[PDB]
Amino acid sequence: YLKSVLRELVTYLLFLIVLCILTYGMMSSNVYYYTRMMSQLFLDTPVSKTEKTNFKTLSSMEDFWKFTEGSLLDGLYWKMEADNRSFIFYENLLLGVPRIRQLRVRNGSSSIPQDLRDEIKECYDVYSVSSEDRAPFGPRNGTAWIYTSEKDLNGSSHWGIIATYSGAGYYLDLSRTREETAAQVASLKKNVWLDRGTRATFIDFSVYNANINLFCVVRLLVEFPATGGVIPSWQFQPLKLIRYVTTFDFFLAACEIIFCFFIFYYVVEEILRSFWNCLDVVIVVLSVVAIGINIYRTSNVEVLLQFLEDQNTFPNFEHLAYWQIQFNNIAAVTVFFVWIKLFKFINFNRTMSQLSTTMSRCAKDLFGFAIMFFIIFLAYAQLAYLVFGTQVDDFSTFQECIFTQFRIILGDINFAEIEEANRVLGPIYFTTFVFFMFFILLNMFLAIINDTYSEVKSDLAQQ
Amino acid sequence: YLKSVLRELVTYLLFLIVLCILTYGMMSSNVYYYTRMMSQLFLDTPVSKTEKTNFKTLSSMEDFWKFTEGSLLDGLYWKMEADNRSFIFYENLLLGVPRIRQLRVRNGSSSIPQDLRDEIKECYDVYSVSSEDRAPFGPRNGTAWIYTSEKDLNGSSHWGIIATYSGAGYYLDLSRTREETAAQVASLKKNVWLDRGTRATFIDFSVYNANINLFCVVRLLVEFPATGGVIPSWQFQPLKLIRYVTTFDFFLAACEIIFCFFIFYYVVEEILRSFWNCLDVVIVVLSVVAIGINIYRTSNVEVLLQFLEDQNTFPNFEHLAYWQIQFNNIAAVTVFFVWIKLFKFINFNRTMSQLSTTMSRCAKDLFGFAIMFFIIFLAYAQLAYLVFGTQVDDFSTFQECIFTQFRIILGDINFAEIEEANRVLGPIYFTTFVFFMFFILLNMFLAIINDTYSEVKSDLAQQ
């Protein structure tokens, strides 16, 4: 039994390091700064030398147009060298051509107050697939003014902060030179290409670095609520598209196929309560999905080979970025559980074996009270979301209300804006919540543990 | 008994979802940004392009006048389209006409130092209803220089940060165009309309959005302590005045009448200790008040129909805003308690039934020590309020002293300004407080729980 379990033990250990390497391998070290530089270059720089706003700060269409004609252009272009080529920071190819796309809503004049009408007029509804405007507004002289379909226009539905956005819309592809684009942009600014009905706009472009070998994929997303104003958001995604350069890169490819063998091995072992069984299943599952994604999704690299042919087009990577995110998401979670599986082997010692059974007994009593806990915890949340959330950012959405309360329990708080929001309930909410939750209810957990812990020490001491 | 209780159970459940819908229904999603845009447009923008102060920052009359003639005007007006009409952000009707009002105090020269007199001269006392100045100061050519009464001038006493303010005062109604107002404002600036005796000023206007259907009601409040300086405060209230547009809006109206039936049902059941009884009463009570407000207060909508007739006047909404706040306040609290009522049904399981009786026994011992606790907790508060509170904002008022101490217990602290305030007691206060309260006294709670918890597990285990 011992050696039999010890047989599986090393199998697990061998399985550990293989994965630990792929993580270490598939992750370059300094990637962070590469993003950080890109981000600061775009997000953090003043729109114009005269203006103090950043892209993070954009409050208006006027703000936006400034940003376009402003730092963005300066951000994208450098001199240097072709001269049709520009290296960002001097280290980074601007890869192919940038693309701007927007979404427009059909005229919503249907909405009827009674009675106002000619004192309005019309309106435009909140973005929806139904409300999406396909009419060819404006001079109709190009893709900018002509609707295209998410099928015809290669692209995927993007999930924004207030809404999901289809790939379809009105778009334009920029130029290789800072000037030609400016001409294009100004033309789009001269003609009004951002109107009442423009809910959201996209700016997508990709960047390659040759020093380290990586691609940065950028989506600048700007939303226009029916309430007016601007909600900027951004995404910077590094990608390793060419997986084979260095011998180490090939060494990982071996390990990847090596790693593939292990899972297939565990697949068989999985075939016939228990917790570790329940655990083992998960790791196997995620592992598969991780691989499936890795193979017939990310390994495609078809867009690259296409773009490599014609480098004057827009290299749509939006999917490739999308998936490796999903990949890293899953890949990480696997590793997390993989470590947790190590506990199954720790019971060798008395103390551990003692502790092992304790937390097991801890579970049932906890799981009951946890229910009792969150019911209250959610009650405040739903309360706060009603009182606040038309005022305070932190409470804006019901999700972040829940989050906010955790930060409160930990002590991260903005109290002032709460008190500003409602001078009465704000204090009451904060006081009562901090009282019952943090003084009493939290302690009720720890109370349960002591009992179940001491009891297990008690009766096992009897043996 | 079981099915009998189960009969009431579903009644509660049905009552839950009805309410959950009205909450979800009566609350639109994205309202937050609508406020946030309005706020940033006014509060957050520089007074003048040359000046770095915001409305939040106003330190002086000069600051104030700048703000009026400054961003405020630019905030209110847009072009566009009548041209007598302006859309804020382009999405928002400026609704009717803005109104400025101030409060003035009778000359307080009565206050006598001995002896100074001609070296002063006179003075003006802190605002009070008694001290309120009704004299027609200045050129006396209009409402600006002529006192009106809160009865004659439709309006309610507003509760400010240093004082409550009657609706009465000296006011002026602005114009539809940015220019005419500027002429008015400048005239009020040319003539001195803000003098030594001006304690507080109001700026009230309303804004409609047609994309979503909502009204934003704005009160810009500026106080002038007898100590000089400025204390700005602001309120942005969304309102749904027209409740009937979409079928969904009508569907809620049905549910509202449907929901009315349930309470009337519970009214009868309430008619004949116990805790749940004590609870059930509360929910019934609040529910009624919520409805009464909803009907003969908020449902009035008389001002709208009046304003709809004449759109060149000032649409006084101050009350309508006031009540829906009270409404949302009560409405929220109800929901909170409604969820809590769900516990009454959770005792089905042993574990829950176990936990249920535990916290019940927890109560008496806690309630005793809680008294013992706050006596100390308040002692520090009253101490801090004496030591600090002439220095530190956080301690300014005795209320916020209490609040501040909670943030300390949680770890939210500004220590520096404490140490700056008093280099001796500041540390001592902070150290001792953090010591006895957080190390010892908090733990004394949790100590009590363990005993009462383990004891209940102990003796019930005997059964």
Place this chain on the structure above:
Amino acid sequence: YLKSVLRELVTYLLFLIVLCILTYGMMSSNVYYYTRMMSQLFLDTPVSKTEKTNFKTLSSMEDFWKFTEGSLLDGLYWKMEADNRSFIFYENLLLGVPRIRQLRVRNGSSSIPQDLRDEIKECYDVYSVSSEDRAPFGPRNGTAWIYTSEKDLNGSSHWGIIATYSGAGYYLDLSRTREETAAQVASLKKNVWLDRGTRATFIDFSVYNANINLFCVVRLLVEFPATGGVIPSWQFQPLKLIRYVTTFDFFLAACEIIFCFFIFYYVVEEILRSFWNCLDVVIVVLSVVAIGINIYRTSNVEVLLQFLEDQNTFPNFEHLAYWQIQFNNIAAVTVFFVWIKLFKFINFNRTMSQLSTTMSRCAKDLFGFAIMFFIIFLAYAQLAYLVFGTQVDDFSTFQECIFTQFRIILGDINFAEIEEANRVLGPIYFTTFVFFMFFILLNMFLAIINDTYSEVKSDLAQQ
């Protein structure tokens, strides 16, 4: 026994409200903003319209001179009305005349490196009473260039942040008009009145408000370490000098004499372990000192009556401010203990009487471990002070090291600057400290309480 104790009970209660009133009475409500306005007017305003530094920010002599000739002058003067008079904010008399004073150190060339000499030359030592320079440097045409004595120059030793400073030094009294002062200041700037040997400078002036009746006393303190640079500090003290205006003010005077009777009563009762006895002594003690200060110190008001005669001089209030601080310090502490004395009466109930004896038994075991605790707690402190404190502000002095660790236990942290200071020990210190202290050692307290609590519940339950 019961009624006998009940006799003392009401005596205490009557004693409570009397004190509660004097606190409420002797403290006006809105004083905070009065300070806050003054502070922001001076501390918070840019030195010059072109410059972004505040008084809080001063880094250099050049910074300082700018501030003097800069915002300070603008801060002090207003127009308006005599015109020799100016109202700050328009609400505040500039009271009398401002005064600037500095401290200078004898030339410290004695300090000998071996060997440098003519490559230096000389030096100036850190401020001390010994090192204080009495030589009449400069043109010697006035008090600015002539040393005076703290006896001759009415004044008290002030306690600064890096050093205590005698009242003596080189000073100048300003003028009633913004211009004349500027001439004076410029002359002091033309001639070099701030030299290598100038360790610290003072700016003292007082301000009266007639709306509410109060005096604000201001000390602007600027230190010049031997290391160069500037360390600004400031003090704003409100004073109520004329205690008799309103009938309420006279009503307090009655209560004050009334309150005097109570203490004299308790004096006798104090005359013959125990804790409450030990407590009762303290309250009596502090009460006396509070009164003694109140009478033959603060009630003097001699400087006022002198200044009232000649309003063109400098009204030295530095002492009067100094004492009422001491007064408020003591006065507050008394109130704090007074509330605590209320516990002596709470044992009526079983639960309280139960809890009462528990914490009493809690004491001995705690007091032992507390020693064990701080020994470690101080160890880290002394460690951090050695590692940090040449780098991080928070650790600058050993005192604030102790303070800083409390904020860490609570979660208030600046970690970045720690890691920046020492990339190795910084993490180790922070990690280990947070580990042993917060995980283990804190819990060791709470462990003790449970035992001593449950035991007391246990054995008393046996009865």
Place this chain on the structure above:
Amino acid sequence: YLKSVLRELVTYLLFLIVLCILTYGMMSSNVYYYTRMMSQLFLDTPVSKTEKTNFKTLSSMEDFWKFTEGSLLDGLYWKMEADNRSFIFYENLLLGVPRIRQLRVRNGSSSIPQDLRDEIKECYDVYSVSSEDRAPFGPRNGTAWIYTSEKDLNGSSHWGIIATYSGAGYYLDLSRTREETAAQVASLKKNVWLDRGTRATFIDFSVYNANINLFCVVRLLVEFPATGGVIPSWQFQPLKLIRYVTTFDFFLAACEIIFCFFIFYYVVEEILRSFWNCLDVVIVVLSVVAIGINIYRTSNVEVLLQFLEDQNTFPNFEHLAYWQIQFNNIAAVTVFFVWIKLFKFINFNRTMSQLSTTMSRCAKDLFGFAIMFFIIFLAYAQLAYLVFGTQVDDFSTFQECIFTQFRIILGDINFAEIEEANRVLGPIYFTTFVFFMFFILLNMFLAIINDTYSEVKSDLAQQ
């Protein structure tokens, strides 16, 4: 036995104060501000009057060159007096001559994407000793363009934030006057002395203060990742080079030799489990290393005596600074343990002796669970490092991930940037982590303590 232990007790006490003095003695008080002034003078000042960036803010080569030609020069030079001499703040000799050095990497065109080539061209790899470029780029007219060796160029490998850097490289020595340097700098800017291949640059200079007797050694370090951009870092090290000036300084020298006797005494006593034995060893060890460093490393002072001869050269102190850091590091840690040794003497009292054996028994059960704890704690860390760390600064490196989680447990959090990084896992990570770790797992510690504490009180009470 008692007096025998009491014999060692005073030996320890005498050993305490000797060390406490050396700490107090070898540490001057106000050194902090001396650094703080230097830091703010360089780090905190705008690059140019027109520019808002600080040295901390440098984002680009252009930023850097500005800083050089900018505030740095102004920071170093002052007038005053030779005039070839300049006093920083007027209090500080610029000591000798500043020196700039950079590191360059061989052209990395070897890196092959397939296929791009002439669309790149070339590249430059991440810094390494191998990749280090020794070629004499540029006009080759001086040390700036000529490679030197860390042997030939006196210097030590420096440990930067992304990499360790050899002392070797391309350097230049500046001039005594602000102008001549500017000519040099401009020449280095005219010619391109910062190219694609420049990974990191150094700016080293030293400063003496004669008021207090100290040296400040400065290393300004600027890194250029292969990703472009700039990563500034800085070091300010005070040094006491001349240990003999004041009699007090000589008094310490006596104590130092006195202190040397004690350790040699303990050396013998150390010669023959136990914990205190294990402890005593450590203190002895560190003490030795501290002394050895103090003698044949720091006491060398050879560079000074050399520099004192020729004051126009670069006074390389980099080592001297390096070691006294190591010295202070060790010196501090010793003191820390020295205090801890005091516990060995505290068992005189019952309570202490009681507590002593408790925590001893606490150990074994804790040490087991601590393992169980960190396994999970690290799991999240490794998870967060995969999910985040390409986005969030706080998670950038695996080390700081661990650190970040502690700050979370304490409540120091930036949640926003987490949610921005990954809108899905970010919340999940934060929520689950805060849940299991802070609610459950932490309490599991405290659970263990209660058992082991109460049990020890229980059975010892039986005696």
